Amino acid sequence: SGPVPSRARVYTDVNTHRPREYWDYESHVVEWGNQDDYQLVRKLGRGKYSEVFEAINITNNEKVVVKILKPVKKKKIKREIKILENLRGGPNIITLADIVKDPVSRTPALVFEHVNNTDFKQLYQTLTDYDIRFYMYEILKALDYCHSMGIMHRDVKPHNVMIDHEHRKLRLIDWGLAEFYHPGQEYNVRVASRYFKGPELLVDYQMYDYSLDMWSLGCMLASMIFRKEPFFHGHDNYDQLVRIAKVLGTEDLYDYIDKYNIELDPRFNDILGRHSRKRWERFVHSENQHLVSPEALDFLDKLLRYDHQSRLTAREAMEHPYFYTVVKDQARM
């Protein structure tokens, strides 16, 4: 018959217990400011949906980041604004400062409190063992917070982690793909970048939850501790699942498919083959051995599961022995 339904293990009903206006972003009324309170200084980045600029707030000479949105459904814009407003002031969440339109072009833009244009991808292949643990813990604070607030990011990847390494500060950015979790809701599987897509996305299981972000986090961790970018290097979305199957093995994949009664795209029938679950020791070599420990491998193993329900939650991840020295030093400071 149909796919077997699924529910988030944690924060299942948090949006239900909120007022409608918290999560009903389509009904959100945006007060659009004037982009001429800002002067653009320089281009920081370009994305599928926006051009990103360093800018100055003329009124207080404060540095900001302006994300000038390429044309898009009003619905998607309200969703991102409402999520950013809901998460504002949260640990390691980018701060939305203002919402503006160019008076002439009427192009909408989001104004964020300034952070360094240095994305995590620029230096996550050069970190010490301790700093990987430190920054991973900081990302988990942001995920446990947004999950606790009924929101899944759905685009967790190095490019969406802005780090000020000098001040050991981290922000999770680009909430453009983020959604509210509602129990029983079926979501678009066309989210996240190929290398970070969870198996639920790749086999077209739509009733997914916060646990999607914990797969993406596992992909990031594996890439850092093994110095292998990306860890799962698919040619396309079909081959992406093959790359996962060659590590996690096909037995747990077919058990997962069976458990949720997933109808596997016929394209998979010839390409998945039959693979053992590989021991992580397989990826350890002289140039990454200093970043790999039993703690790191035990932690990674508990993120990278086919079955979304079997993955650590953000808070369970934060309690893993891998972070004991980070937790201790945090209390010390």
Ligand X SMILES: Brc1c(Br)c(Br)c2[nH]nnc2c1Br
Site string for ligand X, 30-69 (x = CB under 6 A): -----x--x-x---xx-x----x--x---------xxxx-
Closest separation between CB of residue 147 and Na ion, Å?
A: 31
Within residues 176-205, the interface with ligand X by CB under 6 A covers: none
Find the residue with minimal CB distance to ligand X: 35
Work out what residue 157 binds among Na ion, Cl ion, ligand X, none; the CB cut-off runs from 5 to 8 Å by kind.
Answer: Cl ion
Which residue, 216 or 313, has its beta carbon nearer to Cl ion?
216
Within residues 282-321, the interface with ligand X by CB under 6 A covers: none
* Cβ–Cβ under 8 Å, residues 183 and 7: yes
To the question of whether residue 51 is assigned a binding role by annotation, the answer is: yes
For residue 53, list its beta bridge partners: 43, 66
Query: Tokens 């070599």 label which residue?
Result: 285
To the question of whether residue 2 is assigned a binding role by annotation, the answer is: no
CB atoms inside a 10 Å sphere around CB 231: 22
Tell me the catalytic residues.
Answer: 155
**Terminal CA-CA length for the chain:** 55
Cα–Cα dist 68/49, whole Å: 9
To the question of whether residue 127 is assigned a binding role by annotation, the answer is: no
Give me the DSSP letters along 174-210: --TT-EE--TT----S--S-GGG--HHHHTT-----T
Write the CB contacts of 67 (distance below 8 Å, at least 6 apart in sequence).
50, 51, 52, 109, 110, 111, 112
CB atoms inside a 10 Å sphere around CB 60: 8
Which residue, 38 or 306, has its beta carbon nearer to ligand X?
38
**153 lines the binding site for Cl ion (CB under 5 A):** no
Q: Which residues contribute to the annotated binding site for ATP?
A: 44-52, 67
Binding residues (CB under 6 A) for ligand X: these are 35, 38, 40, 44-45, 47, 52, 55, 65-68, 94, 100, 102, 105, 107, 109, 112, 115, 117, 162, 173-174
Q: Which residues bind to Cl ion, rule: CB under 5 A?
A: 121, 157-159, 278-279
